[PDB]
Amino acid sequence: DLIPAPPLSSVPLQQNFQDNQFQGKWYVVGLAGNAILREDEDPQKMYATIYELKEDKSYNVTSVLFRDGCDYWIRTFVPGCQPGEFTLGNIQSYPGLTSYLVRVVSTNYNQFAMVFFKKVSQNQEYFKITLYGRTKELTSELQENFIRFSKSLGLPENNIVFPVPIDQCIDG
């Protein structure tokens, strides 16, 4: 009894998405989804994601996280059906991962973004929304819009966290 993924008709797409302006480092300031839980003796720690636009218009996408120590994982997001949407490249290479979808919901490129993800993995549907910031903090107002958007997708307050800013790893 995991919360079902919302229909896609409920997830907006950023109008006139600009791939070149979305490049760069984004810090995950907010995180919400059906497998995310407000854990208090091990609160989630902030991580970063770096997007890099290639000649073929896919992104190299690199996640940097603290764990023992630092992990850097690089993946490929391939432009999907409509601008702002992507699929995961080389999906054959991820075991038990059946599908993966990304949709940029909104962004102003130089301050924040909200991005929606939905995947099917070991035969289960998982989704999440990240609130990306170009810095490690954002306004209260942008946090509230993120919370409201998340609730609009069926998530209660417990499935929404704000990762604590850190210095190890994520900046190198």
Numbering used by the authors: 6 to 72, 74 to 178
Text of the article:
We have previously studied an endogenous protein, called LCN2, also known as Neutrophil Gelatinase Associated Lipocalin (NGAL) or Siderocalin (Scn), which has several characteristics useful for the safe excretion of iron. Second, LCN2 captures catecholates, which in turn bind iron; these are produced by Gram negative bacteria, such as the siderophore Enterochelin (Ent), and potentially by mammals, such as the catechol metabolites of amino acids and dietary polyphenols. The ligation of Ent:Fe3+ by LCN2 is a critical step in bacteriostasis because sequestration of Ent:Fe3+ reduces iron transport to bacteria and limits their growth. Fifth, the kidney captures the majority of circulating LCN2 (50–70%) via filtration followed by reabsorption from the lumen of the proximal tubule, whereupon it is degraded.
Hence, to identify residues required for megalin binding, we mutated 18 positively charged amino acids on the surface of LCN2, based on information from its crystal structure (K15, 46, 50, 59, 62, 73, 74, 75, 98, 118, 142, 149, 157; H165; and R43, 72, 130, 140). To define the structural basis for iron trafficking by K3, we solved its crystal structure. Views of the molecular surfaces of LCN2 (top) and K3 (bottom) coloured according to electrostatic potentials, showed the large effect on the chemical character of LCN2 by the resurfacing mutations. Nonetheless, superposition of native and K3 structures demonstrated a high degree of overall structural conservation, including complete conservation of the ligand-binding site. In other words, neither the fold nor the ligand-binding site of LCN2 were affected by the mutation of surface residues, allowing K3 and K3Cys to efficiently traffic Ent:iron. The addition of native or K3, however completely blocked the Ent- or catechol-mediated conversion of Fe+3 to Fe+2 (P<0.05±LCN2 with either Ent or catechol:iron, Student's t-test; n=3 each) and the subsequent oxidation of HPF to fluorescein (P<10−7, Student's t-test, n=3, across all points). In sum, biochemical, cellular and animal data, suggested the hypothesis that K3 and K3Cys bypassed the proximal tubule as a result of a failure to recognize megalin. Fortunately, K3 maintains almost all structural and functional features of the native protein permitting iron transport.
